Protein backbone atom coordinates (compact mmCIF):
# COMPACT_ATOMS: atom_id res chain seq x y z
CA UNK A 1 0.00 0.00 0.00
CA UNK A 2 1.17 3.50 0.93
CA UNK A 3 -1.23 4.65 -1.81
CA UNK A 4 -3.22 8.29 -1.65
CA UNK A 5 -6.49 8.14 -0.32
CA UNK A 6 -9.49 7.45 -3.00
CA UNK A 7 -10.23 11.82 -3.09
CA UNK A 8 -12.70 13.80 -5.39
CA UNK A 9 -11.32 16.41 -7.70
CA UNK A 10 -9.90 18.97 -5.96
CA UNK A 11 -12.17 21.50 -7.48
CA UNK A 12 -15.04 19.80 -6.76
CA UNK A 13 -13.69 19.33 -2.82
CA UNK A 14 -12.80 22.98 -2.41
CA UNK A 15 -16.21 24.60 -3.87
CA UNK A 16 -18.20 21.81 -2.22
CA UNK A 17 -16.02 23.95 0.98
CA UNK A 18 -16.95 27.31 -0.60
CA UNK A 19 -20.66 25.87 -0.84
CA UNK A 20 -20.93 24.31 2.22
CA UNK A 21 -20.22 27.12 4.12
CA UNK A 22 -21.96 29.93 1.82
CA UNK A 23 -24.98 28.52 2.12
CA UNK A 24 -25.16 28.69 5.99
CA UNK A 25 -24.68 32.46 5.18
CA UNK A 26 -21.18 31.89 6.65
CA UNK A 27 -19.50 34.08 3.87
CA UNK A 28 -20.09 37.41 3.19
CA UNK A 29 -21.73 38.74 -0.60
CA UNK A 30 -18.91 38.99 -2.73
CA UNK A 31 -16.18 38.21 0.24
CA UNK A 32 -13.86 35.85 -1.57
CA UNK A 33 -14.49 37.35 -4.82
CA UNK A 34 -12.88 40.57 -3.36
CA UNK A 35 -9.90 38.36 -2.11
CA UNK A 36 -9.20 36.89 -5.00
CA UNK A 37 -8.75 40.45 -6.58
CA UNK A 38 -6.71 41.80 -4.26
CA UNK A 39 -4.83 38.46 -3.83
CA UNK A 40 -4.48 38.92 -7.93
CA UNK A 41 -4.05 42.69 -8.55
CA UNK A 42 -3.07 44.54 -5.40
CA UNK A 43 -0.50 42.71 -3.89
CA UNK A 44 2.10 42.76 -5.82
CA UNK A 45 6.48 42.85 -5.87
CA UNK A 46 5.29 46.01 -8.49
CA UNK A 47 5.44 47.53 -4.55
CA UNK A 48 8.49 46.21 -3.32
CA UNK A 49 10.37 47.08 -6.06
CA UNK A 50 9.08 50.82 -5.50
CA UNK A 51 10.41 50.48 -2.32
CA UNK A 52 14.08 49.40 -3.31
CA UNK A 53 13.93 52.18 -5.92
CA UNK A 54 12.70 54.61 -3.62
CA UNK A 55 15.94 53.49 -1.04
CA UNK A 56 18.41 53.13 -3.87
CA UNK A 57 18.25 57.05 -4.65
CA UNK A 58 16.78 58.25 -1.25
CA UNK A 59 19.28 57.26 1.88
CA UNK A 60 17.19 59.15 4.59
CA UNK A 61 14.13 56.21 3.34
CA UNK A 62 16.87 53.71 2.76
CA UNK A 63 18.39 54.13 6.26
CA UNK A 64 14.20 54.39 7.65
CA UNK A 65 13.35 51.29 5.42
CA UNK A 66 16.81 49.32 7.33
CA UNK A 67 15.59 50.56 10.90
CA UNK A 68 12.16 50.06 10.79
CA UNK A 69 10.84 48.47 7.79
CA UNK A 70 7.06 48.32 8.51
CA UNK A 71 6.72 52.27 8.89
CA UNK A 72 8.84 52.56 6.08
CA UNK A 73 6.41 50.49 4.27
CA UNK A 74 2.99 52.24 5.95
CA UNK A 75 4.33 55.41 4.11
CA UNK A 76 3.04 53.91 0.52
CA UNK A 77 0.13 51.86 2.54
CA UNK A 78 1.37 48.46 1.34
CA UNK A 79 0.98 47.09 5.06
CA UNK A 80 -1.26 44.23 4.77
CA UNK A 81 -1.94 40.37 5.85
CA UNK A 82 0.97 38.60 6.15
CA UNK A 83 2.69 41.83 5.68
CA UNK A 84 2.24 43.71 9.09
CA UNK A 85 5.91 43.72 10.67
CA UNK A 86 8.11 44.32 8.36
CA UNK A 87 12.37 43.76 8.20
CA UNK A 88 14.08 44.61 5.07
CA UNK A 89 17.66 43.32 5.12
CA UNK A 90 20.26 44.81 3.05
CA UNK A 91 22.53 43.09 0.49
CA UNK A 92 26.09 44.45 0.61
CA UNK A 93 29.39 43.54 -1.97
CA UNK A 94 30.46 40.90 0.85
CA UNK A 95 26.69 39.56 2.38
CA UNK A 96 23.81 38.14 0.40
CA UNK A 97 20.64 37.65 1.50
CA UNK A 98 18.00 35.31 0.88
CA UNK A 99 14.51 34.65 2.63
CA UNK A 100 12.15 31.07 2.66
CA UNK A 101 9.49 30.07 5.17
CA UNK A 102 10.65 26.33 5.60
CA UNK A 103 7.87 24.98 7.52
CA UNK A 104 4.77 26.15 4.97
CA UNK A 105 5.13 29.39 2.89
CA UNK A 106 5.39 32.60 4.65
CA UNK A 107 5.83 35.67 2.73
CA UNK A 108 5.50 39.61 2.65
CA UNK A 109 2.41 39.33 0.39
CA UNK A 110 1.15 42.80 0.22
CA UNK A 111 4.87 43.71 -1.20
CA UNK A 112 6.33 41.22 -2.79
CA UNK A 113 2.94 39.51 -4.03
CA UNK A 114 1.46 35.45 -2.73
CA UNK A 115 4.38 33.17 -3.34
CA UNK A 116 5.39 31.13 -6.76
CA UNK A 117 4.55 27.50 -6.55
CA UNK A 118 8.44 27.04 -6.29
CA UNK A 119 8.93 29.16 -3.30
CA UNK A 120 6.51 26.33 -1.33
CA UNK A 121 8.19 23.54 -3.08
CA UNK A 122 9.57 20.82 -0.29
CA UNK A 123 12.72 21.34 -2.48
CA UNK A 124 13.34 24.84 -1.88
CA UNK A 125 11.65 24.45 1.57
CA UNK A 126 14.56 21.67 2.70
CA UNK A 127 17.38 23.00 0.51
CA UNK A 128 18.09 26.10 1.00
CA UNK A 129 18.46 26.68 4.38
CA UNK A 130 21.03 23.91 4.32
CA UNK A 131 22.76 24.55 0.12
CA UNK A 132 21.41 28.07 -0.54
CA UNK A 133 25.03 28.41 -2.75
CA UNK A 134 24.03 25.33 -4.69
CA UNK A 135 20.68 26.36 -5.03
CA UNK A 136 20.84 29.87 -6.20
CA UNK A 137 23.36 28.68 -8.77
CA UNK A 138 21.23 25.79 -10.02
CA UNK A 139 18.22 29.01 -10.64
CA UNK A 140 20.71 30.33 -12.30
CA UNK A 141 22.46 32.96 -9.75
CA UNK A 142 26.34 32.64 -9.16
CA UNK A 143 27.32 33.87 -5.48
CA UNK A 144 31.20 34.11 -5.07
CA UNK A 145 32.23 32.14 -2.54
CA UNK A 146 33.81 35.64 -1.17
CA UNK A 147 30.15 36.64 -0.11
CA UNK A 148 28.31 35.35 3.21
CA UNK A 149 24.42 33.88 2.01
CA UNK A 150 22.50 34.47 5.00
CA UNK A 151 19.36 32.84 4.83
CA UNK A 152 16.24 34.36 6.65
CA UNK A 153 14.24 31.64 7.51
CA UNK A 154 10.32 33.04 8.25
CA UNK A 155 8.89 31.33 11.22
CA UNK A 156 6.92 33.47 13.49
CA UNK A 157 5.21 36.97 12.70
CA UNK A 158 8.52 39.01 11.09
CA UNK A 159 7.67 39.16 6.99
CA UNK A 160 10.77 40.31 5.00
CA UNK A 161 12.11 41.80 1.52
CA UNK A 162 15.34 41.88 0.34
CA UNK A 163 17.12 45.25 -0.01
CA UNK A 164 19.12 44.43 -3.25
CA UNK A 165 22.57 45.98 -3.81
CA UNK A 166 22.49 48.69 -6.92
CA UNK A 167 23.84 47.57 -10.35
CA UNK A 168 26.26 49.60 -11.73
CA UNK A 169 25.24 50.51 -14.88
CA UNK A 170 22.19 52.48 -13.61
CA UNK A 171 23.59 55.39 -12.39
CA UNK A 172 20.87 58.41 -12.72
CA UNK A 173 17.94 56.38 -13.69
CA UNK A 174 14.67 57.33 -12.38
CA UNK A 175 12.74 54.97 -9.63
CA UNK A 176 10.90 54.04 -12.63
CA UNK A 177 13.50 52.61 -14.70
CA UNK A 178 15.12 51.28 -11.65
CA UNK A 179 12.38 49.62 -10.45
CA UNK A 180 11.58 47.79 -13.99
CA UNK A 181 14.77 45.68 -13.01
CA UNK A 182 14.09 44.65 -9.40
CA UNK A 183 11.73 41.52 -9.85
CA UNK A 184 9.66 39.22 -7.81
CA UNK A 185 13.04 37.21 -7.48
CA UNK A 186 15.18 40.08 -6.69
CA UNK A 187 12.81 40.87 -3.48
CA UNK A 188 12.73 37.11 -2.51
CA UNK A 189 16.71 37.41 -3.00
CA UNK A 190 17.31 34.15 -5.43
CA UNK A 191 17.86 36.71 -7.99
CA UNK A 192 20.38 40.05 -8.35
CA UNK A 193 19.28 42.76 -9.84
CA UNK A 194 20.31 43.08 -13.98
CA UNK A 195 20.80 45.91 -16.27
CA UNK A 196 20.27 45.13 -19.99
CA UNK A 197 23.44 44.33 -21.72
CA UNK B 1 5.10 18.62 16.18
CA UNK B 2 8.37 16.80 15.01
CA UNK B 3 6.00 16.19 11.44
CA UNK B 4 6.99 15.66 7.91
CA UNK B 5 6.45 19.67 7.30
CA UNK B 6 9.71 20.25 9.16
CA UNK B 7 11.60 19.93 5.76
CA UNK B 8 14.46 22.41 6.48
CA UNK B 9 17.74 20.23 6.55
CA UNK B 10 16.35 16.96 4.63
CA UNK B 11 18.43 15.82 1.81
CA UNK B 12 17.51 13.91 -1.33
CA UNK B 13 14.97 16.59 -2.98
CA UNK B 14 16.01 17.34 -6.40
CA UNK B 15 16.35 20.84 -8.51
CA UNK B 16 13.78 23.74 -7.62
CA UNK B 17 11.36 23.83 -10.35
CA UNK B 18 12.23 27.33 -11.14
CA UNK B 19 15.02 29.33 -12.72
CA UNK B 20 15.04 33.00 -11.89
CA UNK B 21 12.53 35.28 -13.64
CA UNK B 22 10.73 32.56 -15.08
CA UNK B 23 7.70 33.40 -15.90
CA UNK B 24 5.51 31.70 -13.13
CA UNK B 25 1.74 32.41 -14.48
CA UNK B 26 -1.16 33.74 -12.96
CA UNK B 27 -1.64 34.35 -9.16
CA UNK B 28 -3.69 31.56 -9.35
CA UNK B 29 -3.97 28.48 -12.12
CA UNK B 30 -7.30 27.25 -11.33
CA UNK B 31 -10.45 28.85 -10.55
CA UNK B 32 -10.75 27.16 -7.06
CA UNK B 33 -7.28 28.63 -6.08
CA UNK B 34 -8.33 31.40 -4.62
CA UNK B 35 -10.95 29.32 -2.26
CA UNK B 36 -8.13 28.62 0.61
CA UNK B 37 -6.96 31.97 1.68
CA UNK B 38 -10.05 33.49 1.15
CA UNK B 39 -12.14 31.06 3.28
CA UNK B 40 -9.14 30.84 5.70
CA UNK B 41 -9.71 35.22 6.09
CA UNK B 42 -13.31 34.22 6.37
CA UNK B 43 -12.72 31.63 9.20
CA UNK B 44 -9.95 34.09 11.17
CA UNK B 45 -11.63 37.53 10.68
CA UNK B 46 -15.54 37.26 10.02
CA UNK B 47 -16.00 33.78 12.41
CA UNK B 48 -14.17 34.33 14.96
CA UNK B 49 -14.03 30.19 14.58
CA UNK B 50 -9.64 29.82 14.43
CA UNK B 51 -6.41 31.54 14.32
CA UNK B 52 -3.70 31.28 11.84
CA UNK B 53 -1.82 29.01 13.96
CA UNK B 54 -4.47 26.59 14.21
CA UNK B 55 -4.58 26.57 10.13
CA UNK B 56 -0.84 25.98 10.20
CA UNK B 57 -1.16 23.22 12.31
CA UNK B 58 -3.92 21.19 11.16
CA UNK B 59 -2.38 21.04 7.90
CA UNK B 60 1.11 20.04 9.85
CA UNK B 61 -1.40 17.11 11.01
CA UNK B 62 -2.44 15.95 7.37
CA UNK B 63 -1.10 11.95 7.58
CA UNK B 64 2.57 12.26 6.30
CA UNK B 65 2.04 10.66 2.77
CA UNK B 66 -1.33 12.65 2.23
CA UNK B 67 0.74 15.91 2.95
CA UNK B 68 3.57 14.73 1.34
CA UNK B 69 1.31 14.08 -2.47
CA UNK B 70 -1.08 17.43 -2.02
CA UNK B 71 -0.15 20.40 -3.33
CA UNK B 72 0.08 23.45 -1.93
CA UNK B 73 -3.41 25.50 -2.44
CA UNK B 74 -5.25 21.69 -1.65
CA UNK B 75 -3.27 21.34 1.83
CA UNK B 76 -5.24 24.06 3.11
CA UNK B 77 -8.89 23.15 1.48
CA UNK B 78 -8.41 20.47 2.97
CA UNK B 79 -6.91 22.24 6.40
CA UNK B 80 -9.64 24.83 6.47
CA UNK B 81 -12.13 22.35 5.51
CA UNK B 82 -11.25 19.94 9.07
CA UNK B 83 -11.06 22.98 11.08
CA UNK B 84 -14.55 23.34 10.29
CA UNK B 85 -15.64 20.16 11.49
CA UNK B 86 -13.54 19.60 14.28
CA UNK B 87 -15.39 23.30 15.67
CA UNK B 88 -18.73 21.98 14.93
CA UNK B 89 -19.68 24.30 12.34
CA UNK B 90 -19.51 21.58 9.35
CA UNK B 91 -20.24 17.93 9.34
CA UNK B 92 -17.37 15.64 7.04
CA UNK B 93 -21.60 14.19 5.58
CA UNK B 94 -21.73 17.84 4.29
CA UNK B 95 -18.39 18.27 2.16
CA UNK B 96 -18.35 14.32 0.94
CA UNK B 97 -22.20 14.95 -0.38
CA UNK B 98 -21.40 18.13 -1.82
CA UNK B 99 -18.09 16.90 -3.33
CA UNK B 100 -19.62 14.13 -4.61
CA UNK B 101 -17.09 11.87 -3.39
CA UNK B 102 -14.41 11.51 -0.61
CA UNK B 103 -13.07 14.34 1.46
CA UNK B 104 -10.42 13.04 3.64
CA UNK B 105 -9.42 15.32 6.21
CA UNK B 106 -6.23 15.68 8.55
CA UNK B 107 -5.60 13.67 11.57
CA UNK B 108 -6.68 14.50 14.87
CA UNK B 109 -4.51 16.10 17.32
CA UNK B 110 -2.70 14.18 19.52
CA UNK B 111 -1.61 17.37 22.04
CA UNK B 112 -3.35 19.47 24.06
CA UNK B 113 -1.07 22.19 23.30
CA UNK B 114 1.21 23.87 26.04
CA UNK B 115 0.95 27.58 27.72
CA UNK B 116 3.37 30.37 27.14
CA UNK B 117 6.33 29.61 29.15
CA UNK B 118 6.31 31.51 32.54
CA UNK B 119 9.82 31.59 32.95
CA UNK B 120 11.45 33.48 29.56
CA UNK B 121 14.47 36.25 29.49
CA UNK B 122 14.67 39.50 27.59
CA UNK B 123 17.01 39.09 25.40
CA UNK B 124 19.19 42.14 24.10
CA UNK B 125 21.06 42.19 20.48
CA UNK B 126 24.21 40.70 20.53
CA UNK B 127 23.47 38.30 23.01
CA UNK B 128 23.96 34.54 22.28
CA UNK B 129 21.64 32.52 23.35
CA UNK B 130 20.53 28.50 22.81
CA UNK B 131 17.44 27.20 21.38
CA UNK B 132 16.08 24.95 24.55
CA UNK B 133 16.11 21.42 24.01
CA UNK B 134 12.65 20.71 23.98
CA UNK B 135 10.51 18.03 21.87
CA UNK B 136 6.74 19.37 21.58
CA UNK B 137 4.47 17.01 20.03
CA UNK B 138 1.89 20.17 19.28
CA UNK B 139 2.19 22.86 17.50
CA UNK B 140 5.60 24.69 17.73
CA UNK B 141 7.00 27.71 15.46
CA UNK B 142 10.99 26.03 15.81
CA UNK B 143 12.25 23.91 13.13
CA UNK B 144 13.89 20.93 14.10
CA UNK B 145 17.55 22.01 12.66
CA UNK B 146 17.72 24.83 15.39
CA UNK B 147 16.51 22.28 18.54
CA UNK B 148 19.44 23.08 21.39
CA UNK B 149 21.75 25.24 19.06
CA UNK B 150 23.80 28.43 19.93
CA UNK B 151 23.25 32.05 17.83
CA UNK B 152 23.17 35.42 18.47
CA UNK B 153 20.43 37.62 18.84
CA UNK B 154 19.95 40.49 15.43
CA UNK B 155 16.82 42.08 16.62
CA UNK B 156 14.08 42.13 19.21
CA UNK B 157 10.99 42.55 17.95
CA UNK B 158 9.05 45.73 19.23
CA UNK B 159 5.57 44.19 18.16
CA UNK B 160 4.66 40.83 20.63
CA UNK B 161 2.20 37.97 19.93
CA UNK B 162 0.52 34.85 21.03
CA UNK B 163 2.95 32.08 21.86
CA UNK B 164 2.16 29.25 19.25
CA UNK B 165 2.13 26.57 21.22
CA UNK B 166 -0.97 27.69 23.06
CA UNK B 167 -2.77 30.03 20.19
CA UNK B 168 -2.29 26.98 17.32
CA UNK B 169 -4.20 24.47 19.74
CA UNK B 170 -7.00 27.39 20.54
CA UNK B 171 -6.01 27.50 24.00
CA UNK B 172 -6.44 30.57 26.15
CA UNK B 173 -3.25 30.92 27.83
CA UNK B 174 -0.89 32.06 25.03
CA UNK B 175 -0.46 35.29 26.07
CA UNK B 176 2.26 37.22 23.90
CA UNK B 177 5.51 38.00 23.66
CA UNK B 178 8.32 39.07 21.29
CA UNK B 179 10.43 37.37 18.80
CA UNK B 180 13.84 37.46 18.32
CA UNK B 181 16.22 37.50 15.21
CA UNK B 182 18.60 34.64 16.38
CA UNK B 183 21.48 34.19 13.84
CA UNK B 184 23.21 30.79 13.13
CA UNK B 185 26.77 29.80 11.81
CA UNK B 186 25.68 27.38 9.02
CA UNK B 187 27.99 24.85 10.92
CA UNK B 188 26.36 25.07 13.90
CA UNK B 189 23.29 23.34 12.21
CA UNK B 190 24.89 21.33 9.65
CA UNK B 191 28.26 20.77 10.60
CA UNK B 192 30.68 20.35 7.49
CA UNK B 193 27.78 19.73 5.11
CA UNK B 194 26.26 23.17 4.48
CA UNK B 195 27.46 25.72 1.83
CA UNK B 196 25.86 28.63 3.10
CA UNK B 197 27.29 31.48 5.70
CA UNK B 198 24.72 31.65 8.30
CA UNK B 199 20.96 31.35 8.82
CA UNK B 200 18.57 33.30 10.93
CA UNK B 201 15.36 31.80 12.25
CA UNK B 202 12.66 34.31 13.96
CA UNK B 203 12.41 32.73 17.63
CA UNK B 204 9.49 32.98 19.92
CA UNK B 205 10.95 34.40 23.47
CA UNK B 206 9.58 30.79 24.88
CA UNK B 207 11.58 29.19 22.67
CA UNK B 208 15.07 30.40 24.04
CA UNK B 209 17.43 30.55 27.27
CA UNK B 210 20.65 32.43 28.26
CA UNK B 211 23.87 30.50 26.03
FE1 LIG C 1 4.87 29.79 5.59
Known amino acids: ?197 | MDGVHDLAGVQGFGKVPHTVNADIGPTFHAEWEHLPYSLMFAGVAELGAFSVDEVRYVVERMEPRHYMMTPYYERYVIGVATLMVEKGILTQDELESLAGGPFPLSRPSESEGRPAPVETTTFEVGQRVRVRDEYVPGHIRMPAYCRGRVGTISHRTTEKWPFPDAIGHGRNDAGEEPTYHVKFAAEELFGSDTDGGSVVVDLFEGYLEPA
Open chain 1, 1 to 197: ENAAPAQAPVSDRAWALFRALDGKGLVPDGYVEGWKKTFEEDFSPRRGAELVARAWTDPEFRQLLLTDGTAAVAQYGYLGPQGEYIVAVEDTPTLKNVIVCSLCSCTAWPILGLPPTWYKSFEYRARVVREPRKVLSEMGTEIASDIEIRVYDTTAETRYMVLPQRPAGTEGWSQEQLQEIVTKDCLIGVAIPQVPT
